[model samples]
Target: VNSFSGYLKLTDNVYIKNADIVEEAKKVKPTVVVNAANVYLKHGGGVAGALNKATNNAMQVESDDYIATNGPLKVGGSCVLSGHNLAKHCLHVVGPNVNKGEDIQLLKSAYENFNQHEVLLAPLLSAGIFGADPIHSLRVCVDTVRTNVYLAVFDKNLYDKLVSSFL
Candidate 1:
């Protein structure tokens, strides 16, 4: 019997923080590269934690490109999926938990079928809206591998204020 219950696969070698995955990737000169991280986890379990774990990890790849996620685990409750300051692009996605079944698949399909080019910006649920949390939503968002510019805003009021201030 396998100790790991979930299905997992590895197509290429993986690297973690401090390993210089980006530098290594450049040396390899691969045409396609994908990087992912879980933003919801409490890093090192402390206040001055590595909050930039996801960004830092993805940075190693040097493309301003990578996927961020909270993994498949959910802690029942409404949480916010905060978007990060990615250089080139960042895709923010939401997913259904164990309670919500195939609905997530439908949403994924919608994401796939939608004309992705026109999508300029999206909202990051950094706060729990109604009941859904942001990080969880982000997990679902990154699952879809799409090549495009992804921008996210978390606070409506702050967003509006910033826009007005700029205007």
Candidate 2:
């Protein structure tokens, strides 16, 4: 296993760290794992895909139900699903499209919607296939909520930079 490093607290509860998100999910056993999804709640790509695979594709059924009732989820809109193997709940948020200037706030709104879960596992929102700046997404994640937030990353260089800034 690749050794991980880095930790920073942005608030009483929010934190940033370098670790495999899947491993961290197993270790922490959070009540909820936030899925960075699109309006359709498709979990076939990005962090959502990873979580979906990890949980045995359990999110798909609930996601499909949400879409059926609510239609396409708007950016900043969110919903919760049953957690399969890891968490008790899976929070799904529709994230911003790339180059959308208002997405940061939209992302923040999505983050703000998170509550009730004691431990929440989240990726750098919109930083993967959505193509938002990871650092900017990280900032928004840290700033938006008071929940016990775990920011997962797979890149050592990115982790190093974040740690350096804090140190």
Write one digit per residue (lDDT tens) for candidate 1, span 1-167: 21111211211111111112233233333222222222333223111022235455433232223223334323221222333332133332232332333243433432342134333233322222223444444443445425331322334554344334331
TM per candidate: 0.26, 0.83
Model 1 gets an lDDT of: 0.30
Candidate 1 runs further than 4 Å off: 1-105, 113-115, 124-130, 156-167
Best by lDDT: 2
lDDT of 2 at 106: 78
Q: How high is the lDDT of residue 34 in model 2?
A: 80
* Cα lDDT computed for each candidate against the true fold: 0.30, 0.73
Question: Where is model 2 more than 4 Å wrong at Cα?
Answer: 1-7, 99-102, 115-118
Q: Which 10 residues in a row give candidate 1 its minimum summed lDDT?
A: 10-19
Give candidate 1's TM-score. Answer: 0.26
